[PDB]
């Protein structure tokens, strides 16, 4: 409910 | 926007959300074949996977669950009915539920 935990930004964490 | 704003851990998470939000859309609409942008190819994999997934929304897949999340924040901040974002159209067309492809 009200936005699921978005592990995708962890799976694809943008680092440089 | 800027000035004297403070980014707390929660907000930095939401920030990373909007980052992977833009990541999702970029991958969803990236017509550029030569674009080897790191987040692009990675997102394009995540996106194109949802396409061939069946455990997506029945409380099984993590990837497609999380991609649904990003597309949902975005879904409220989106108007296009033929949006490139896969889970956007599934979400912002349903609006009530969330499951994609019913
Ligand atoms: Zn791209
Ligand atoms: Zn999946
Ligand atoms: Zn959209």
Judging contacts by C-beta atoms under 8 Å, the chain B residues touching residue A2 are none
Counting one residue from chain A and one from chain B, the pairs whose CB atoms sit within 8 A come to 49
Where in the sequence is the domain holding B86, given as residue range(s)?
Answer: 9-94
Identify the DSSP state of B16. H
C-alpha B96/C-alpha B87 separation (Å) is 14
Domain membership flag for residue B101: no
- What DSSP line would sit under B40-87, residue for residue? HHHHHHHHHHHHT-SSTTTT--SHHHHHHHHHHHHHHT---TT-S-HH
Domain membership flag for residue B75: yes
Judging contacts by C-beta atoms under 8 Å, the chain B residues touching residue A8 are 20, 24, 46, 63, 66-67, 69-70
Contact A9 B43 (CB under 8 A): no
Angstrom distances, CA of residue B78 to CA of B3, B25, B59, B69, B72: 26, 10, 25, 14, 9
Within 8 A by CB and 6+ apart from A10, the residues are none
Domain membership flag for residue B102: no
Q: What is the CATH number of the domain that holds B73?
A: 1.20.1020.10
C-alpha A3/C-alpha B9 separation (Å) is 17
Domain membership flag for residue B100: no
C-alpha B55/C-alpha B17 separation (Å) is 23
Question: Determined by which method?
Answer: NMR
Domain membership flag for residue B42: yes
Domains in chain B, number: 1
Buried b (16+ CB within 10 A) or exposed e, B3-33: eeeeeeeeeeebebbebbbebbbbbbebeee
Domain membership flag for residue B1: no
């Amino acid at each position: 409910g009200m936005y699921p935990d978005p592990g995708l930004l962890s799976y694809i964490n943008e680092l440089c | 926007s800027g000035g004297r704003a403070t980014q707390s851990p929660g907000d930095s998470r939401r920030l990373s959300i909007q980052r992977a939000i833009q990541s999702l859309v970029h991958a969803a609409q990236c017509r550029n074949a030569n674009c080897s942008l790191p987040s692009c190819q990675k997102m394009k994999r995540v996106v194109q996977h949802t396409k061939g997934c069946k455990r997506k929304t029945n409380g099984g897949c993590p990837i497609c669950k999380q991609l649904i999340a990003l597309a949902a924040y975005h879904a409220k901040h989106c108007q296009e009915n033929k949006c490139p974002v896969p889970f956007c159209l599934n979400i912002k067309q349903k609006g009530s539920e969330f499951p994609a492809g019913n």
